[PDB]
Structure formats: structure tokens, C-alpha cells
Amino acid sequence: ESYSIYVYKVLKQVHPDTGISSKAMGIMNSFVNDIFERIAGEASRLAHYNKRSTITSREIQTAVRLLLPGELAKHAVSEGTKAVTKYTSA
Amino acid sequence: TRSSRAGLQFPVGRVHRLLRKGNYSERVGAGAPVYLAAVLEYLTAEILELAGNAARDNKKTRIIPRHLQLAIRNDEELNKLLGRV
């Protein structure tokens, strides 16, 4: 239904002793959904610009580099590429 | 499980389902939801890190909305990313 439990699991890694209120968890869910929609929409247009019928990790990466500022873009690219490399190793 | 193979906590299967259901393209490559789930997880961590720091500076034991607001506004990059949400 939402990302709350996964947000909580990430919270337990970054700040194990810190809780989160129900209202703040609602805001976090709003941020994740908004970022999801922004990247997927941009990857959709890029695949259209490239005359490709499929959204691949190439379009996700390009959307990420163009939508996020500065250091966030660099680290998000590092994290996405690491996940894909682990995933395809398996 | 897809998320475990990618080393992620975020649900790759659901991100895949949401990419397919949203009529973003005709097809979705297997790597696309992995990459995207990884980016969402990282962005979540960065927000919680700074909101968590604000709660601790506030001598508080949990993150509340005011801590998220503080974290976004006082971080140039998160403010650029989310300041319009």
C-alpha cells in the first residue's frame, strides 16, 4: 500500500535509536511517491525521444542525472549502478 | 528475491509493478526497477539522516514533521529537490 515499513527499515540503518511520528512517516511516503513519479516520467520521455519501446536502466540513470542536483545525483548514480551490478551477478 | 539480489531494502518487485502499471512505456527492462528502487532508497536515507540529525540537535527521540521541514530547508540540495513538494 505504501513504503512505510521500508522507510522505517532505512531509518533503523541511519539512526537506529530514532523513531518517526505517524505524520512524519506520511510526509516521507509523499516524498518517495513524488520522486518516483518524477524519475519514471522523465525516463518515459527519454525513451520516447530515443524511439525505444522499453524503459531500461539506461533511461533511469539519465533521468536521475538530469533531475537531481549536484552531489545527490552522483551518489544516486553510484547506488543505482551498484544495485544493478549486484542484481545481475546474483 | 529481487530486492535481496540487489542488496536493497526497498521493494524492487513493487517498483516494477508500478512502472508497468503506470503506462510509462510498452516494456520495462529488468534492471530499470532495480536502479530506481536503489535511488529511492538512497534518497530516503539522505532525508532521514538529516531529519534525524535535526531531531537529535532538538534533544528529541523521534523525527516529527518540523524536523523534516528543517532538514529540507537547511540543505541546499534537498531544498532544490523537494522544496516545491
Binding site: S4, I5, Y8, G19, I20, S21, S22, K23, A24, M25 | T61, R62, I64
Partner: peptide
Amino acid sequence: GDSESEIEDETFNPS
């Protein structure tokens, strides 16, 4: 003075 905050906005409980 934190169960007062809990009344206003309850803590997210994963279980």
C-alpha cells in the same frame, strides 16, 4: 512531556 506529543501525533509502530 513526550507522551503528550504521542497523543497529538502517534509514533509509527512497525508491528
